[PDB]
Amino acid sequence: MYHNSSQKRHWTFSSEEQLARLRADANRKFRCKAVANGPNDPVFLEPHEEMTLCKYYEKRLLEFCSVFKPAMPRSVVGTACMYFKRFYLNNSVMEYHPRIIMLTCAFLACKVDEFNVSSPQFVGNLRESPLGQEKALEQILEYELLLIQQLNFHLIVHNPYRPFEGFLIDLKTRYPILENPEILRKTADDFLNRIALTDAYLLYTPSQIALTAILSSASRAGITMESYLSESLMLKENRTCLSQLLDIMKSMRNLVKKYEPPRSEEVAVLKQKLERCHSAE
Amino acid sequence: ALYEYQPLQIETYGPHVPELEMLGRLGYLNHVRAASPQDLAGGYTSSLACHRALQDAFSGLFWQP
Amino acid sequence: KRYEKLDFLGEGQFATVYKARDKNTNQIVAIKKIKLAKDGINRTALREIKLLQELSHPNIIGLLDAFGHKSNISLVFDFMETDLEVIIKDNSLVLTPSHIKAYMLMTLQGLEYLHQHWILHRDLKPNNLLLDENGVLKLADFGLAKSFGSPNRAYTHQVVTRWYRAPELLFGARMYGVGVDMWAVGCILAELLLRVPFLPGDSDLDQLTRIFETLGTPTEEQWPDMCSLPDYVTFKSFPGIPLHHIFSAAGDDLLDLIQGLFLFNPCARITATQALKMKYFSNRPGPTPGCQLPRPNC
Ligand SMILES: *[C@H](CC(=O)Nc1ccc(C(=O)Nc2cccc(Nc3ncc(Cl)c(-c4c[nH]c5ccccc45)n3)c2)cc1)CN(C)C
């Protein structure tokens, strides 16, 4: 259950500013360690560059998960993306390469969740030569313990998909004025992916994310379902909580709004810069 | 030194989830797939699924750090 | 690294459990190092890690720490004095009904905590119910425990030690609820009462035969829809010995509780929450305080 989960206690932060503080601290500490072991070197990377690179490689992780040869359940994909976000929230894209950590997060999400994939099959799901597959596999096993340690051994991740299904069940039963919430299901799947892309998972409970997805589908469907929260959620007698739920919904829809995909030239230059950083350690 | 039963009452920030037994004739089970005889032969009842769905739909709503 | 090893405590079938001490605090912990490729950290160690991190109950050990290296790890629980297997197999420790009430009460409290969080401890037996100097039980081995909410999963049908296997598990049930741990608790209760493993088997066939020859082959009405299970093999109508003849030193409340734990119907089998609401735990013999449980010396 989320309400006492380790994710809620530790891996859920107050505001986006805390995320930025932690990422900037990790990047700056890595820069200090690199300089002190050997400050403005044109090869070092700024936090926004790290953010764009992490966005691009999270898109890569989504692609790789969706084109997994055995059907990867959405729980494993969400768990892997959350592991990626958590790892790079407290670590830098320069110290550990995001492709290897992407694959390691996918592997540890396959293994922590009860998805059963044999490691040779997992690497055979990559686009490389068999010797390259073996190198990638040995890198993944080398980095798995590091990934687990940097997650502070909090391996359980609560996705918004189960609360999304629960909310649809509630809408089906207790909310009769709304009918056929399957269209809401499609548009909420779309919004839920688009919100997985941003940093909302570290700032909002999965239940809030699922409720926001379904109500955003209602809003974009021309369906006003504000009555659902007011009555049949007991919030009409709790005004502060209802106001806070509407505030959270608005803030996180706007958080979706102020997210732009990583560019093409910018990601290319950051990629080549990242390779130069990995070569000249 | 007698023992008296205490409900565990672990805090769940969110609306009160309907109780497992008081959940079949509230209409909830009409919208979760039926427990197939193989499923129902074991402890599974297709109401555990609905109850967990409802319990994680309200896990944390009225919570923000 | 920080933990200095004191003594070798045992060898679970997938890991080796040693005793150690920490420097930041003067106390004693138990390390559990996974045995030793090509497939990363052992998945049992990840069940322990991922699943003991989110539970905070007095009657469930929480792993204090975890460390490791390239492909092997070792978990750090608090060192925990003994387990019910030693106490049961001990002969000098007489278990008055108060002692067994305390043990069963603590087990059932821990199990209701676990089942509320939709975690099923699929391997429960007296060798896993540990208890420390203060005398509080904790469900130790979470090596093979899962979550029993999703209809989308598919459990393998042999994940519990055979003697403590619920019959619905023994017929190879893909989907099962909390009846697993409840039958395991019933078997633990019978073992505590008799100081002998209840229903000692050799295979699935033997375990079914002994279960039904001791409790009675179900009647398609006490456990309806048993025909639907995969491994449903029909045995002749065993009358089954009555319960009050086996647990002769047990009061009527205890017999009612044992009947509840042992219904062959998993769905009609009592759960940990409604097992603790029965009269047995509230009757005049109050469960002993942890300060007065028997200490299995040596
Ligand atoms: C007499 C005095 C005396 O009694 N000495 C003594 C005897 C026996 C023990 C003892 O029971 N130690 C012990 C055994 C088993 C387990 C544990 N603790 C523990 N803690 C955490 C964990 Cl995770 C585990 C565990 C989990 N899975 C496991 C499998 C196998 C083994 C352990 C295990 N266990 C402690 C202590 C003292 C003697 N002389 C003659 C005076």
Domain region containing B48 = 28-55
Where do the domains of chain A lie, and which CATH numbers do they carry?
6-156+261-279 (1.10.472.10), 160-258 (1.10.472.10)
Chain C CA closest to residue B32: C151
**Does residue B38 lie within any of the structural domains?**
yes
Residue C264 distance to chain B (closest CA, Å): 10
C54 is annotated as contributing to ligand binding: no
**C168/B45 Cβ within 8 A:** no
- Rounded to whole angstroms, how far apart are CA atoms C287 and C285? 7
Whether the CB of C171 is below 8 Å from some CB of chain B: the reply is yes
Resolution of the experimentally solved model in angstroms: 3.3
C292 is annotated as contributing to ligand binding: no
A47 CB contacts (<8 Å, ≥6 apart)? A20, A23, A24, A27
Q: Which residue bears the tokens 């597959």?
A: A133
Nearest partner of C131 among C286, C288, C290, judged by Cα? C290
Are residues C176 and B44 in contact, defined by beta-carbon separation less than 8 angstroms?
Answer: yes
Are residues C83 and C129 in contact, defined by beta-carbon separation less than 8 angstroms?
Answer: yes
Q: C9 in ligand 1 pocket by Cβ < 6 Å?
A: yes
Q: What residue type is assigned to position C74 of the chain?
A: S
CATH of C4-78, one of 3.50.50.60, 1.10.150.120, 3.30.200.20, 2.40.30.60: 3.30.200.20
Catalytic positions of C are 123
Atom of ligand 1 nearest to the CA of C86: 11
**Does residue B40 lie within any of the structural domains?**
yes
Give the side-chain half-sphere CA count within 13 A for A9. 11
**B5/C267 Cβ within 8 A:** no
Specify which residues C119 forms β-bridges with: C147
Chain A CA closest to residue C153: A114
b/e for A3-37, b at 16 or more Cβ within 10 A? bbbbbbeebbbeebeebeeebeebbeebbeebeee
Question: How many structural domains compose chain B?
Answer: 1
**Ligand 1 center to residue C81 CA distance, Å?**
5
Specify which residues C28 forms β-bridges with: C21
Phi, psi of A102 (to 5 degrees): -60, -50
Residues of C in contact with A148 (CB under 8 A): 41, 49
Q: How many CB atoms lie within 10 A of CB C64?
A: 17
The three-class DSSP label of residue A130 is helix
| Secondary structure of chain B as H, E, C letters | CCCCCCCCCCCCCCCCCCCCCCCCCCCHHHHCCCCCHHHHHCCCCCHHHHHHHHHHHCCCCCCCC
**Does residue B36 lie within any of the structural domains?**
yes
The secondary structure of chain B in percent helix, strand, coil, rounded to multiples of 5, reads: 30, 0, 70
Closest residue (by CA) to atom 22 of ligand 1?
C30
Nearest partner of C131 among C97, C71, C87, judged by Cα? C87
- Rounded to whole angstroms, how far apart are CA atoms A167 and A181? 10
Q: How many CB atoms lie within 10 A of CB C254?
A: 24
C194 CB contacts (<8 Å, ≥6 apart)? C246, C247
Asked whether the CA dihedral A11, A12, A16, A18 is positive or negative, the reply is: negative
Residue B20 distance to chain C (closest CA, Å): 11
| Pick from B1, B2, B42: CB nearest C173 | B42
Q: C62 in ligand 1 pocket by Cβ < 6 Å?
A: no
Chain B interface residues (partner A, CB cutoff 8 A): 10-16, 26-28, 30-32, 50, 52-65
- Rounded to whole angstroms, how far apart are CA atoms A244 and A255? 16
**Does residue B1 lie within any of the structural domains?**
no
**C286/B2 Cβ within 8 A:** yes
Q: What residue type is assigned to position A278 of the chain?
A: H
Q: C13 in ligand 1 pocket by Cβ < 6 Å?
A: no
Residue-range domain boundaries for chain C: 4-78, 82-278
CATH architecture of C82-278: Orthogonal Bundle (1.10)
Structure tokens at C66: 């975890």
Q: Which residue bears the tokens 């044992």?
A: C258
**Ligand 1 center to residue C3 CA distance, Å?**
17
- Rounded to whole angstroms, how far apart are CA atoms A29 and A32? 5
Q: How long is chain B?
A: 65
Are residues C81 and C131 in contact, defined by beta-carbon separation less than 8 angstroms?
Answer: yes
Are residues C15 and C35 in contact, defined by beta-carbon separation less than 8 angstroms?
Answer: yes
A180: left (phi over 0), alpha (psi -120 to 50) or beta: left
Experimental method: cryo-EM
Structure tokens at C25: 């605090």
Q: Is C40 exposed, middle or buried (0-12, 13-18, 19+ CB in 10 A)?
A: buried
Q: What residue type is assigned to position C159 of the chain?
A: V
Structure tokens at C76: 């750090």
Distance between start and end Cα atoms, chain C = 30
Residues of B in contact with A156 (CB under 8 A): none
